[PDB]
Design a protein around this ligand. Structure first.
Ligand SMILES: COc1cc2ncc3c(c2cc1-c1cn(C)nc1C)n(-c1c(F)cncc1OC)c(=O)n3C
Lengths: 312, 148, 142
């Protein structure tokens, strides 16, 4: 109640179209690269009903729960999540170098423990390997699709992991199309690729399956750039879509000019699809490398909102 | 060979610094920046924006200074990359009031052989005037360079 | 000679110039029986590739040139009437951008190889659709 669910529904439809595009291509079809989707049925402007994903748990609830979180059962001598959040909130008003020093100090004493999810839930090595591979592939496809659509506000409570399948599901898709960068203390990462997600992939990190799945998804995105452009162009000119950021949502998230901003978003998405980044044309591998380094850079993570929980 | 290596090393550093400075300037002139500022214009957020803008200007000035210094160093060593005097003079002319690039031109810009600035004589003589003065004034340094 | 008009300012003129360059029938006949298909296309693609490799230097040179106070490139109605009997910063940024796509090879929003760009330029130059629209003083048939 008291929420608008139409945006979630149309994001789900775009995700379904991307799933169809991925299924068409043989290279992604072999890897079973899919975007997890759910049915959303808005009932009014402020009310709606939507599917409940059974067997899933928020990654934030699993990781940084105060009473039974992973960071408490594992690495008990490290900083509690409360201390990390308090320090990051305290350093908010200070300068950027102080923010960087505090962020690295927190990260040094707060180490990722997300790898043990599949280890504890799946004891058979074959099942463990299969679930870890599925997790890495889901992370890769979700990251690429979110970057293409400019998904934002990807904090810990907005991502669900399926206990049975070890796949990631993204919820609360209100902020998209790079509108998170227009916010105060803007988001400076294409997608959430913090230390926990990287650690859960394995010892190889992003070097192995994740990178290749990213290039395959990006190549599929490129080959279908025109259809994606048409879909997004139809979507954005929806009178009831309401994607443009406004100050009320800006304050809520962190406690005709429409034609110009729309055509700007279309040109930005077109540049993303063709691979033109910072004015330089890039291959799929180069674009993937740029996105990964921008995602994992501690410099970018330090400047983020503590609500985003970069250290987590 | 040691000189040639220095020239390439100075040129590479200058190009990287120029790339970073150009990225910062493009972000400054980008429409996303003005849209974010307009969104702000609609009390701690204003202070945060002021700090961010000041730090961004500081980073831009730092990158510009490094690029100018490395261009000056590269032009001194040899003659294969004389055509980068175009980029060097563009950076100097656009940033007239920095007072650091003017100082570096006054100190090390004079050491550059004068024949290297010959292709840019028309533009340099068109820009030169008498409004600004002083040891580090842009017009005074430009007049000295033209005279030399 | 008479290099007054440059940087696509002729496209702004009444009855705009719709050809990248003069490649009329007399010029093509000048090469010989092979026409543009022979040495002309190869030389064009090689020089285009060389200019692509040095895009940064050309961009810097043109940026220095256009910001010259006395250069006076922008077309004004007086020159427009003479030829065929602040906004300046925006126009300069626009022409720098257009030169950037030319050097990179992006034409009509589509990235192209050197050969594709050369072929597109040649077909625009020799196209009767474009040649018919030109000013009589241009003498396209000649
Ligand atoms: C399709 O929508 C959902 C499906 C869910 N399925 C399982 C599940 C959820 C789900 C949340 C949403 C949802 C979408 N929006 C815009 N808002 C909400 C809320 N939550 C969950 C949470 F992650 C965060 N906040 C609250 C949550 O439950 C009330 C959770 O703990 N589990 C196990």
């Amino acid at each position: 109640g008291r929420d608008d669910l139409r945006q979630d529904a149309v994001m789900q439809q775009v995700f379904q179209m991307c799933n169809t595009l991925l299924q068409r291509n043989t290279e992604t079809r072999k890897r079973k690269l899919t975007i997890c989707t759910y049915k959303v049925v808005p009932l009014s402007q402020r009310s709606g009903v939507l599917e409940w994903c059974t067997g899933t748990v928020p990654i934030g609830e699993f990781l940084v729960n105060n009473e039974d979180g992973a960071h408490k059962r594992y690495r008990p001598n490290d900083f509690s999540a409360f201390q990390c959040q308090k320090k990051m909130m305290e350093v908010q008003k200070k300068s950027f170098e102080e923010k960087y020093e505090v962020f690295m100090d927190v990260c040094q004493n707060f180490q990722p423990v997300f790898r043990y999810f599949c280890m504890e839930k799946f004891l058979d090595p074959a099942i463990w390997f299969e679930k870890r591979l599925a997790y890495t592939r889901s992370v890769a496809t979700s990251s690429i699709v979110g970057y293409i659509l400019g998904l934002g506000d990807r904090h810990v409570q907005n991502i669900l992991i399926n206990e049975q399948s070890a796949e990631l599901v993204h919820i609360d898709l209100g902020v998209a199309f790079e509108q998170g960068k227009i916010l105060p203390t803007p988001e400076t990462v294409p997608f959430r690729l913090t230390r926990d997600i990287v650690d859960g992939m394995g010892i190889t990190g992003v070097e192995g399956v994740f990178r290749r799945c990213c290039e395959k998804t990006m190549e599929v995105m490129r080959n279908s750039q025109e259809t994606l452009l048409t879909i997004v162009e139809v979507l954005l000119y929806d009178p009831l879509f309401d994607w443009t950021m406004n100050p009320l949502k800006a304050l809520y998230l962190q406690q005709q000019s429409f034609n110009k901003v729309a055509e700007r978003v279309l040109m930005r998405l077109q540049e993303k699809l063709k691979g033109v980044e910072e004015g330089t044309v890039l291959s799929v591998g180069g674009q993937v490398n740029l996105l990964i380094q921008q995602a994992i850079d501690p410099k970018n993570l330090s400047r983020l909102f503590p609500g985003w929980k970069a250290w987590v | 060979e040691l000189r040639n290596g220095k020239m390439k090393a100075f040129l590479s550093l200058a190009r990287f610094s120029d790339t970073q400075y150009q990225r910062i300037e493009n972000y400054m002139k980008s429409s996303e920046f003005e849209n974010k500022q307009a969104l702000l214009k609609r009390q701690r957020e204003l202070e945060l924006d002021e700090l961010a803008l000041r730090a961004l200007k500081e980073d831009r000035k730092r990158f510009l200074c490094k690029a100018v210094e490395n261009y000056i160093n590269c032009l001194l060593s040899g003659e294969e990359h004389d055509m980068w005097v175009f980029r060097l003079c563009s950076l100097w002319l656009e940033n007239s009031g920095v007072s650091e690039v003017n100082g570096m031109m006054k100190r090390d810009g004079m050491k550059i052989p004068t024949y290297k600035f010959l292709p840019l004589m028309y533009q340099l003589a068109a820009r030169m005037g008498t409004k600004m003065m002083g040891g580090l004034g842009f017009h005074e340094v430009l007049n000295n360079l033209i005279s030399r």
